[PDB]
Design a protein around this motif. Sequence first.
Motif, PDB file in Angstrom:
ATOM      1  N   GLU A 267      38.042  61.665  34.090  1.00  0.00           N
ATOM      2  CA  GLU A 267      38.232  60.975  32.822  1.00  0.00           C
ATOM      3  C   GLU A 267      38.048  59.477  32.984  1.00  0.00           C
ATOM      4  O   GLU A 267      37.640  58.786  32.046  1.00  0.00           O
ATOM      5  CB  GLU A 267      39.620  61.292  32.268  1.00  0.00           C
ATOM      6  CG  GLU A 267      39.900  60.732  30.888  1.00  0.00           C
ATOM      7  CD  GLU A 267      40.314  59.279  30.921  1.00  0.00           C
ATOM      8  OE1 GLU A 267      40.731  58.807  31.997  1.00  0.00           O
ATOM      9  OE2 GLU A 267      40.214  58.607  29.876  1.00  0.00           O
ATOM     10  N   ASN A 268      38.356  58.954  34.166  1.00  0.00           N
ATOM     11  CA  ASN A 268      38.387  57.510  34.343  1.00  0.00           C
ATOM     12  C   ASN A 268      37.003  56.876  34.336  1.00  0.00           C
ATOM     13  O   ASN A 268      36.904  55.656  34.172  1.00  0.00           O
ATOM     14  CB  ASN A 268      39.099  57.164  35.645  1.00  0.00           C
ATOM     15  CG  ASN A 268      39.570  55.741  35.679  1.00  0.00           C
ATOM     16  OD1 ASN A 268      39.632  55.076  34.649  1.00  0.00           O
ATOM     17  ND2 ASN A 268      39.913  55.259  36.863  1.00  0.00           N
ATOM     18  N   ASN A 269      35.939  57.658  34.522  1.00  0.00           N
ATOM     19  CA  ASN A 269      34.598  57.080  34.555  1.00  0.00           C
ATOM     20  C   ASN A 269      34.248  56.439  33.216  1.00  0.00           C
ATOM     21  O   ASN A 269      34.113  55.215  33.114  1.00  0.00           O
ATOM     22  CB  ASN A 269      33.582  58.158  34.926  1.00  0.00           C
ATOM     23  CG  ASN A 269      33.252  58.154  36.396  1.00  0.00           C
ATOM     24  OD1 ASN A 269      33.921  57.500  37.185  1.00  0.00           O
ATOM     25  ND2 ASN A 269      32.214  58.885  36.773  1.00  0.00           N
ATOM     26  N   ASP A 270      34.075  57.262  32.182  1.00  0.00           N
ATOM     27  CA  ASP A 270      34.020  56.832  30.789  1.00  0.00           C
ATOM     28  C   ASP A 270      32.763  56.049  30.433  1.00  0.00           C
ATOM     29  O   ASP A 270      32.511  55.786  29.254  1.00  0.00           O
ATOM     30  CB  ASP A 270      35.255  55.998  30.437  1.00  0.00           C
ATOM     31  N   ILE A 271      31.961  55.675  31.427  1.00  0.00           N
ATOM     32  CA  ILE A 271      30.715  54.978  31.130  1.00  0.00           C
ATOM     33  C   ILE A 271      29.537  55.725  31.733  1.00  0.00           C
ATOM     34  O   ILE A 271      28.508  55.930  31.078  1.00  0.00           O
ATOM     35  CB  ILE A 271      30.776  53.523  31.628  1.00  0.00           C
ATOM     36  N   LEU A 272      29.669  56.140  32.992  1.00  0.00           N
ATOM     37  CA  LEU A 272      28.604  56.810  33.720  1.00  0.00           C
ATOM     38  C   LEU A 272      28.755  58.323  33.710  1.00  0.00           C
ATOM     39  O   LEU A 272      28.451  58.971  34.713  1.00  0.00           O
ATOM     40  CB  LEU A 272      28.555  56.306  35.158  1.00  0.00           C
ATOM     41  CG  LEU A 272      28.765  54.812  35.368  1.00  0.00           C
ATOM     42  CD1 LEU A 272      28.679  54.470  36.837  1.00  0.00           C
ATOM     43  CD2 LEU A 272      27.737  54.034  34.591  1.00  0.00           C
ATOM     44  N   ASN A 273      29.227  58.897  32.610  1.00  0.00           N
ATOM     45  CA  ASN A 273      29.485  60.329  32.537  1.00  0.00           C
ATOM     46  C   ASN A 273      28.267  61.065  31.999  1.00  0.00           C
ATOM     47  O   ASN A 273      27.919  60.918  30.825  1.00  0.00           O
ATOM     48  CB  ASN A 273      30.692  60.609  31.648  1.00  0.00           C
ATOM     49  CG  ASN A 273      31.997  60.487  32.385  1.00  0.00           C
ATOM     50  OD1 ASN A 273      33.026  60.166  31.795  1.00  0.00           O
ATOM     51  ND2 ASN A 273      31.967  60.745  33.683  1.00  0.00           N
TER      52      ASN A 273
ATOM     53  N   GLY B 293      35.025  68.577  25.788  1.00  0.00           N
ATOM     54  CA  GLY B 293      35.155  67.882  27.051  1.00  0.00           C
ATOM     55  C   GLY B 293      35.454  66.412  26.860  1.00  0.00           C
ATOM     56  O   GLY B 293      36.395  65.880  27.452  1.00  0.00           O
ATOM     57  N   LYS B 294      34.665  65.735  26.025  1.00  0.00           N
ATOM     58  CA  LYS B 294      34.767  64.282  25.935  1.00  0.00           C
ATOM     59  C   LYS B 294      36.180  63.835  25.588  1.00  0.00           C
ATOM     60  O   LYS B 294      36.841  63.188  26.404  1.00  0.00           O
ATOM     61  CB  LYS B 294      33.776  63.736  24.912  1.00  0.00           C
ATOM     62  CG  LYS B 294      33.494  62.261  25.070  1.00  0.00           C
ATOM     63  CD  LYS B 294      32.128  61.911  24.531  1.00  0.00           C
ATOM     64  CE  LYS B 294      31.930  60.416  24.462  1.00  0.00           C
ATOM     65  NZ  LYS B 294      32.388  59.868  23.161  1.00  0.00           N
ATOM     66  N   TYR B 295      36.664  64.180  24.401  1.00  0.00           N
ATOM     67  CA  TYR B 295      38.063  63.952  24.071  1.00  0.00           C
ATOM     68  C   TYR B 295      38.858  65.219  24.338  1.00  0.00           C
ATOM     69  O   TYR B 295      38.593  66.272  23.763  1.00  0.00           O
ATOM     70  CB  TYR B 295      38.223  63.541  22.614  1.00  0.00           C
ATOM     71  CG  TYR B 295      37.011  62.861  22.045  1.00  0.00           C
ATOM     72  CD1 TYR B 295      36.734  61.540  22.338  1.00  0.00           C
ATOM     73  CD2 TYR B 295      36.154  63.533  21.205  1.00  0.00           C
ATOM     74  CE1 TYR B 295      35.630  60.912  21.820  1.00  0.00           C
ATOM     75  CE2 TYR B 295      35.047  62.913  20.681  1.00  0.00           C
ATOM     76  CZ  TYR B 295      34.791  61.604  20.989  1.00  0.00           C
ATOM     77  OH  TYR B 295      33.684  60.986  20.464  1.00  0.00           O
ATOM     78  N   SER B 296      39.856  65.108  25.205  1.00  0.00           N
ATOM     79  CA  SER B 296      40.385  66.285  25.886  1.00  0.00           C
ATOM     80  C   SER B 296      41.188  67.147  24.916  1.00  0.00           C
ATOM     81  O   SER B 296      42.410  67.235  24.971  1.00  0.00           O
ATOM     82  CB  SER B 296      41.221  65.857  27.078  1.00  0.00           C
ATOM     83  OG  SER B 296      40.687  64.678  27.644  1.00  0.00           O
ATOM     84  N   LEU B 297      40.462  67.814  24.028  1.00  0.00           N
ATOM     85  CA  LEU B 297      41.089  68.763  23.123  1.00  0.00           C
ATOM     86  C   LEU B 297      41.631  69.953  23.907  1.00  0.00           C
ATOM     87  O   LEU B 297      41.241  70.195  25.052  1.00  0.00           O
ATOM     88  CB  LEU B 297      40.094  69.239  22.075  1.00  0.00           C
ATOM     89  CG  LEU B 297      39.279  68.119  21.435  1.00  0.00           C
ATOM     90  CD1 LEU B 297      38.453  68.642  20.288  1.00  0.00           C
ATOM     91  CD2 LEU B 297      40.196  67.031  20.964  1.00  0.00           C
ATOM     92  N   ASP B 298      42.537  70.697  23.284  1.00  0.00           N
ATOM     93  CA  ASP B 298      43.103  71.877  23.915  1.00  0.00           C
ATOM     94  C   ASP B 298      42.249  73.086  23.587  1.00  0.00           C
ATOM     95  O   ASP B 298      41.375  73.025  22.723  1.00  0.00           O
ATOM     96  CB  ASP B 298      44.533  72.111  23.441  1.00  0.00           C
ATOM     97  N   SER B 299      42.485  74.185  24.297  1.00  0.00           N
ATOM     98  CA  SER B 299      41.766  75.412  23.984  1.00  0.00           C
ATOM     99  C   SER B 299      42.430  76.160  22.838  1.00  0.00           C
ATOM    100  O   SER B 299      41.749  76.674  21.944  1.00  0.00           O
ATOM    101  CB  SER B 299      41.681  76.294  25.222  1.00  0.00           C
ATOM    102  OG  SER B 299      41.141  75.566  26.308  1.00  0.00           O
ATOM    103  N   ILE B 300      43.759  76.217  22.843  1.00  0.00           N
ATOM    104  CA  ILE B 300      44.491  76.945  21.811  1.00  0.00           C
ATOM    105  C   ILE B 300      44.244  76.326  20.442  1.00  0.00           C
ATOM    106  O   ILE B 300      43.820  77.002  19.492  1.00  0.00           O
ATOM    107  CB  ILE B 300      45.988  76.968  22.153  1.00  0.00           C
ATOM    108  CG1 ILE B 300      46.226  77.833  23.387  1.00  0.00           C
ATOM    109  CG2 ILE B 300      46.795  77.442  20.971  1.00  0.00           C
ATOM    110  CD1 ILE B 300      46.931  77.107  24.502  1.00  0.00           C
ATOM    111  N   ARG B 301      44.507  75.028  20.318  1.00  0.00           N
ATOM    112  CA  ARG B 301      44.365  74.387  19.020  1.00  0.00           C
ATOM    113  C   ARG B 301      42.922  74.417  18.545  1.00  0.00           C
ATOM    114  O   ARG B 301      42.668  74.526  17.343  1.00  0.00           O
ATOM    115  CB  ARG B 301      44.879  72.958  19.075  1.00  0.00           C
ATOM    116  CG  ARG B 301      45.227  72.411  17.720  1.00  0.00           C
ATOM    117  CD  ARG B 301      46.101  73.384  16.966  1.00  0.00           C
ATOM    118  NE  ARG B 301      46.917  72.704  15.973  1.00  0.00           N
ATOM    119  CZ  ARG B 301      46.457  72.256  14.814  1.00  0.00           C
ATOM    120  NH1 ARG B 301      45.186  72.425  14.494  1.00  0.00           N
ATOM    121  NH2 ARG B 301      47.269  71.647  13.967  1.00  0.00           N
TER     122      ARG B 301
END
Lengths: 59, 146, 414, 237, 149
Positions: C131-137, D99-107
């Motif tokens: 998660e900490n990368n945030d730029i080079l992902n 993936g990007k914003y760490s949503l849950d699987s259940i919700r």
Amino acid sequence: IHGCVIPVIHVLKQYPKVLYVSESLSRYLGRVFEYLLNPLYTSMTSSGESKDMATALMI
Amino acid sequence: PLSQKQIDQVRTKVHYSEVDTPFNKYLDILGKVTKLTGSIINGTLSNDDSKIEKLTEQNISQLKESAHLRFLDLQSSIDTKKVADENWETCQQETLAKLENLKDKLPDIKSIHSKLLLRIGKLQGLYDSVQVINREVEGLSEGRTS
Amino acid sequence: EPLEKNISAIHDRDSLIDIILKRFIIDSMTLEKGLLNSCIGLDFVYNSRFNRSNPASWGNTFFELFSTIIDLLNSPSTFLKFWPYAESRIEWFKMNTSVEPVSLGESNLISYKQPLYEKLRHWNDILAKLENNDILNTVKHYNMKYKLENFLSELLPINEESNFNRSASISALQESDNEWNRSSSDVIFAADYNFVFYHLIICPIEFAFSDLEYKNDVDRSLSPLLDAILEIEENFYSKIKMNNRTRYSLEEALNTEYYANYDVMTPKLPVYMKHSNAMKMDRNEFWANLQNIKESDDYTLRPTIMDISLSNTTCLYKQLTQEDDDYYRKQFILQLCFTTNLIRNLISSDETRNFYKSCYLRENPLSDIDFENLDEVNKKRGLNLCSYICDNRVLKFYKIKDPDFYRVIRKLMS
Amino acid sequence: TVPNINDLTTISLCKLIPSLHEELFKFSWISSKLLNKEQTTLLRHLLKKSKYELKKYNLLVENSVGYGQLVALLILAYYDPDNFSKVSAYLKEIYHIMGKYSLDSIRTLDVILNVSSQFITEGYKFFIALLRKSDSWPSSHVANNSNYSSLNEGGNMIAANIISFNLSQYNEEVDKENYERYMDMCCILLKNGFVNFYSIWDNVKPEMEFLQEYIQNLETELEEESTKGVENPLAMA
Amino acid sequence: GRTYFESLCEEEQSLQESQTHLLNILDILSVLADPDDLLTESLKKLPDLHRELINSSIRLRYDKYQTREAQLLEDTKTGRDVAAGVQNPKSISEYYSTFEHLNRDTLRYINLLKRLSVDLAKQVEVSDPSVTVYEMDKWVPSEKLQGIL
């Protein structure tokens, strides 16, 4: 309604009294049974030769 | 009531809790022998009355097996983690390189962007045509006038 | 094969197999062949459980090996190539020590038990680092993090103390173009949207407990924004209704006894396309071409299909006010509705307020938010602005036009 | 800690020196010095939160932007004429977002179910194809629901939890108008093997005991009103 | 000990010396506990080895803390910091903007198909006298007009 008869058959096999709660169960079961039986019914008492009279009047 | 200093002091202990079981085990093997050997130099000896291990040379071999195992486990544990550090670093450098050169990929994206605009053009055109044919049919229907 | 140091190797039997299997995995891993040997060993250790001296001790062994190999994978490409395995044999993870399979739907793993005590800590480390990368992902990274979070969330039951967050309102929600391509009416629109977004949607809690200057500030910033956006949506639905009404009037006046039904307005594919075949083949060829462009290793550094990029002002303007692409306005309306729902419940309920006060306090006994000071001049302005935007305007609007977004937002809020 | 000999004298000596006081908190056994019960309670909580929590956002207002995108995307899928041949692109998009914003699987499964049930009538084809290709579909233990011997084996028990939950909320006023569509979506899912039947039956609101009580009441009232009968007042009183 | 990798290497070198000392201590211990003279020399070699094992261990724990600190110091560096030196921002910005245009255009095109489409009038005339009821949705345009469209 959605044509899945085996769960409800297995439930009403155990608690028959449930039919007293509401009438609609009997009507819907009759719907599926009537669809099941219709093609056998048309093969006898032949109404297929007489099926060709359900048409509407032209304007 | 807790002061700002005390809160910062608990936060630093939390930020560092490590639970590396391979390591704690090897240090424990070193200790279970340092307490015994250190006792023998003192000359206290005794038949394991205290928890200082047992002199009976029948478990000295059991210690020898444990020394070979815990040590080998710790050696593998660190060998694995350094390989992971080498790999993740290489992957991060690789993505940075793809970032440096992207000019070679502007043309294909530009091409799809333009190709899609032509497709929208034609569909918008065909919609104008359906509006023209409908208007001519309307005129025709409403009375006679040609 | 050795079977020669029977008396010597009698001391510690189980540990010996563990260390030799570990060394096997390590030396083979450092591919399509190493992965094969590793998977076979990982299945072997499952199958050889009954023969072990302490049958339960297989658990802490099995997991152990697993962790090691998760470490040795070269790049997220290999990780995604390997994961279908670990998703095949989940039901083997769920039994911590029992040697007989568990009933489907019951897990006997706990956050602080011997098996997970370090493994959950380690995998949370890996998730945090990704998660900490945030730029080079690259998209591979987001796919990997998703696979991992879903695996862990499926392992522990829904009810465990560490499987539902305890009220952490997520920061770092920005949708900007990662500090790339970052820079009249456009500039003021951008500034206003940025201000309201930050202050209201990034932190509903703060914008719920203010000094009556903050509330009125965000209100005087918000009002014209919603005004313009709703005017635009009105133009949109006006175009739709004009088209449909003209077509229906013509098709009605062109037939004997049609008498069209003006009520239904759901969209339907036009006739000259619902039955063609050349056009369908062409559209499918194009979608396939674009999709092939997307899922190619050369273009794995793209943004998602719905990012808004608050950074680049002119792009933001082109996105929100277009009259043909209305999904962005739907996103904005949905955000406002969610946050206003929370603020209203906070202000009025006076029971969730205690829970949020407790949560804020426990992580930080030193704070500044009142959590009690709701005199009434504030409470009034806040619970008024909420019931204004969330109910007076939005629902009243989408109750006459598009009565399907209506049900969507109502169901989601409830 | 390393030498052979030691005692609590080390504890006292460390308690005396304030300079390296924080270094001791960092590495050694400092459970003693941080003795304020408030401190140790704060420590237990901060540890259990920062080390073992999943760091994911499973309530709509928690990660607003995130869910926003997802639900908007979902609407798109039902307004797409060629939506049927682009299932895989949609699944890849949803995974990228989750993936990007760490949503849950259940919700997120719930958010899919709701705005899908909103279009179920004339969307059911694409809906079922979508769920069939997503990895939230029980592939190695698929339920049958058409064989007496298997009405309770297999399925996806997490979806069973969420569904059995959402089917017991008929107290507010807004859900009383969507209960029909939601029940229809579950009835569709409940025959393609997504969840087994008894896992839904055993967990919806009216317990079997309250049902049996209502049944006995109806039986007695009916038998009495039958045998005794009731006088219908025509001009009585 | 500047880097996480280098500190791990120093720790490995500290592990090896401890291991050799431990193994020698164990063998001398076996000789001493074996079922005089050889036992007398061993009973002195054991203190000689003791003036060594604790010092070597000392070092191993010291390095463990050293390595932990470096790992935490490295983990603080976020992604933004590493990409500060990219040589050409321009191309990066052009490429990203292009993707934004392509996304927005795609939504308009898909919206503009079924949702905002405009269609034909639907005037209807049927030749077969048998057809007494017409569906009104199966109406299609004439084949000649369809080719032009």
